[PDB]
Amino acid sequence: TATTPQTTDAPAFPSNRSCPYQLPDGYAQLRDTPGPLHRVTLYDGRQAWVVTKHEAARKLLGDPRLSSNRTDDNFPATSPAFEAVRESPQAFIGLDPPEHGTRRRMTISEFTVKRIKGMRPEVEEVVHGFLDEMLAAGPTADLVSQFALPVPSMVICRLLGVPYADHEFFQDASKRLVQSTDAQSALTARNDLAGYLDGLITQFQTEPGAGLVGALVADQLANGEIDREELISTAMLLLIAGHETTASMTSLSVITLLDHPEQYAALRADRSLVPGAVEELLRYLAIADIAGGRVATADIEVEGQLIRAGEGVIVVNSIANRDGTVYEDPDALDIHRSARHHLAFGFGVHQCLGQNLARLELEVILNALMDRVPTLRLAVPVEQLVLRPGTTIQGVNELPVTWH
């Protein structure tokens, strides 16, 4: 059997967090090793590169030789579940220029600074809505199911024109898809959403409707500028991204802030600090840290290392956000620091489309919690919480809380 030292120069990747707001030990090890790249071993034994420094992450995310095509044979699959995406049609997150741009520009109008400003009343109403329900009822509560998830779900459903009456079905399907550990579970959840979305489209062709899905049906689809299957994939991307990301940030931010009480107190005492604290929480929690998979379509030299055509690269933004050449004392939460230039939303042509909606939601959420529930606290110890694995969007599925 295996009788000799087990040390490797290609550690298994991804790794799981042990603390909700710290790098897994393996990732801290990658962060420490000099050089922009490091070999890793994926779940199926294939080797890939991870990018572990901040400037090299921007350079590689900006390089069009690193393709986002998830259907490529050599795309770095991080779990068996990925096989679902490899064989399903692709929203623009998986396209490269010029096709990427033609699809992304069909959606941008809903996410402009002006549209996001105009959404503030609505976001505050939904947030205070779910709080007055949770507070009317009294502690204890699961903050995830009573607040963290339904808030961004309601907001994104409205933007998309997806009926909130249907929330139990699609929230369930979103979770199963994103947290799937096998191909078959992922495929089923994807087929569930696809069928639901496909029915919604035919409805709008009969009776034009509000929201982005309504607009896409009435314009681009009727002009044959998007295929019906691409519309489904696009809507599914926005639906899932709109649900799962903000919800994960909300629960992890509560946990993290309650663990740094001096900074949470500073935050409450000066609300002009909230936008900066949001950026710092984004930098520090990096909830989509493996949403940086790429395949090289040509050889790329990186500071004397060679990524060859055909090789998988993952730009790991959690690690990149802990680069001490950019953020002094990178592992310290500091809501006053400049968290400018962080990579929690990526960089370049695929930088998060929803990033300013997420910023608005989190600002409104933190202000509301501080205003309405200043006594909020965890109902259980941090160590008792169950953290999702490193193969999915970071966070917790349950968060017990109590208050006055």
> Segment contacting ligand 7ZU (CB under 6 A): 49-57, 70-78, 318-326, 352-360?
70-78
Contacts of 216 (CB under 8 A, 6+ apart): 106, 107, 226, 231, 234, 235
Q: How far is the CB of 15 from ligand HEM (least distance, A)?
A: 18
* Binding map of ligand HEM across residues 237-256, x = CB under 6 A, - = no contact: xx--xx--xx--x-------
> Of how many residues is the chain composed?
404
Residue 19 annotated as binding?
A: no
One-letter amino acid at 147 equals F
* Site residues (CB under 6 A) for ligand 7ZU, limited to 307-336: 314
Residue 178 interacting with ligand HEM (CB under 6 A): no
Q: How far apart are alpha carbons 81 and 78 in whole angstroms?
A: 8
Nearer residue to ligand 7ZU within complex by CB, 91 or 123: 91
249 binds, among ligand HEM, ligand 7ZU, none (CB under 5 to 8 A by kind): ligand HEM
Contacts of 9 (CB under 8 A, 6+ apart): 39
Q: How far is the CB of 227 from ligand 7ZU (least distance, A)?
A: 13
Go through 242-262 and write b for each residue having 16 or more CB atoms within 10 A of its CB, e for each that does not: bbbbbbbbbbbbbbbbeebee
Nearest in space to 156 (alpha carbons), one of 395, 402, 357, 380: 357
Residue 388 annotated as binding?
A: no
Q: Which H or E run includes 245?
A: helix 228-258
Beta bridge partners of 305: 302
**Residue ranges of the alpha helices (H) in 70-219?**
83-87, 99-104, 113-137, 143, 150-160, 167-179, 183-206, 211-216
* Site residues (CB under 6 A) for ligand HEM, limited to 337-396: 344-346, 350, 352-354, 357-358
Tokens of 390: 């490193």
One-letter amino acid at 192 equals D
* Site residues (CB under 6 A) for ligand 7ZU, limited to 232-271: 233, 236-237, 240
The CA distances from residue 365 to 157, 355, 359, 369, in Å, are 18, 15, 10, 6
Q: How far apart are alpha carbons 91 and 11 in whole angstroms?
A: 31
Residue 290 annotated as binding?
A: yes
Residue 233 interacting with ligand HEM (CB under 6 A): no
Nearer residue to ligand HEM within complex by CB, 85 or 358: 358
> Segment contacting ligand 7ZU (CB under 6 A): 45-53, 54-62, 74-82, 155-163?
74-82
Q: How far apart are alpha carbons 223 and 103 in whole angstroms?
A: 14
User: Of these, 37, 40, 93, 249, which contacts ligand 7ZU (CB under 6 A)?
Assistant: 93
Residue 85 interacting with ligand 7ZU (CB under 6 A): yes
* Binding map of ligand HEM across residues 120-149, x = CB under 6 A, - = no contact: ------------------------------
Q: How far apart are alpha carbons 76 and 245 in whole angstroms?
A: 22
Residue 153 interacting with ligand 7ZU (CB under 6 A): no
Tell me which residues touch ligand HEM (CB under 6 A). Answer: 68, 92-93, 104, 237-238, 241-242, 245-246, 249, 287-288, 291-292, 317, 344-346, 350, 352-354, 357-358
Provide the annotated binding site for calciol: 78, 190, 233, 290
Tell me which residues touch ligand 7ZU (CB under 6 A). Answer: 76-78, 81-82, 84-85, 88-89, 91, 93, 177-178, 186, 190, 233, 236-237, 240, 290-291, 293, 314, 392-393
